[PDB]
């Protein structure tokens, strides 16, 4: 995802909050 869910959520679509960073389909992209 490249995004960070330091807040507890992800802005990027289909991106999960994989604190501290974000994730995609359970994979950090």
Curated annotation (Swiss-Prot):
A GO BP entry: defense response to bacterium
Disulfide cross-links: 1-15, 5-17, 10-22
The species this protein was found in: Oldenlandia affinis
Role description: Probably participates in a plant defense mechanism. Has antibiotic activity. Has a diuretic effect. Has a uterotonic effect in humans. Active against the Gram-positive S.aureus with a minimum inhibition concentration of approximately 0.2 microM. Relatively ineffective against Gram-negative bacteria such as E.coli and P.aeruginosa. Inhibitory effect on the growth and development of larvae from H.punctigera. The unmodified form has hemolytic activity, the oxidized form lacks hemolytic activity. If the protein is linearized, hemolytic activity is lost.
Modified how: Kalata-B1 is a cyclic peptide which occurs in three forms: with unmodified Trp-19, with Trp-19 oxidized to form oxindolylalanine and with Trp-19 oxidized to form N-formylkynurenine. Oxidation is enhanced by exposure to sunlight.
Cyclopeptide (Gly-Asn) crosslink, residue number(s): 26-25
Domain topic, free-text comment: The presence of a 'disulfide through disulfide knot' structurally defines this protein as a knottin.
Shown chain mapped onto the complete sequence: 89 to 117 of 124
Membrane keyword on record: no
Family: Belongs to the cyclotide family. Moebius subfamily.
Name the record gives this protein: Kalata-B1
Lineage: superkingdom: Eukaryota
Tissue: Leaves and stems. Lower in roots.
Keyword terms: Antibiotic, Antimicrobial, Cytolysis, Disulfide bond, Hemolysis, Knottin, Pharmaceutical, Plant defense, Signal
């Amino acid at each position: 995802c490249g995004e960070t869910c330091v807040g507890g959520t992800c802005n990027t679509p289909g991106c999960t909050c994989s604190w501290p960073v974000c994730t995609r389909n359970g994979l950090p992209v």
